[PDB]
């Protein structure tokens, strides 16, 4: 069912996203781009110290709404 996740940056900024567990990481990175304009091929996402793969899904990493996700991206 369509759930709300929260991708935080190291500066303490938080991006709320409405996602489906079946959604891929590329898919989530596409949402982040439509909102703050960061190209997906330049975002890195983290969950529980793991670097997330474009190809795998939120389901695969067992990401719930309460999940602590991190975003790193280039200064360029």
């Amino acid at each position: 069912g369509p759930m709300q996740i929260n991708v935080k940056t190291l500066t303490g900024t938080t991006i709320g996203l409405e996602v489906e567990p079946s959604d891929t990481i590329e898919n989530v990175k596409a949402k982040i781009q439509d909102k703050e304009g960061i190209p997906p091929d330049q975002q890195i996402l983290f969950f529980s110290g793991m670097q997330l793969e474009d190809g795998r899904t939120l389901s695969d990493y067992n990401i719930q709404k309460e999940s602590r996700l991190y975003l790193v991206f280039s200064l360029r």
């Binding site: 983290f46 529980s48 110290g49 790193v72 200064l75 360029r76």
Partner: protein, 75 residues
């Protein structure tokens, strides 16, 4: 007879476990950012180097121009 001193000491012990679990929750939040900070450092490093290049190339062209300007002021 002293079952309610053991029961009350069990309680007092859980009050400590809860405090530690709570401190270990907050520790865990910090520690999971460590790989994030490593990644942040690597990207910023590549950002810096990539910008030194673009600016070095632009520093060359600016001298070439300043050298081409002074050679043609021999006229």
């Amino acid at each position: 007879q002293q079952l309610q001193q053991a029961e009350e000491a069990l309680v007092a012990k859980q009050e400590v476990i809860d405090k530690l679990k709570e401190e270990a929750a907050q520790h865990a939040i910090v520690m999971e950012t460590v790989p994030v900070l490593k990644a942040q450092a690597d990207i910023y490093k590549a950002d810096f180097q990539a910008e030194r290049q673009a600016r070095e190339k632009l520093a060359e062209k600016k001298e070439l121009l300043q050298e081409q300007l002074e050679q043609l002021q021999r006229e």
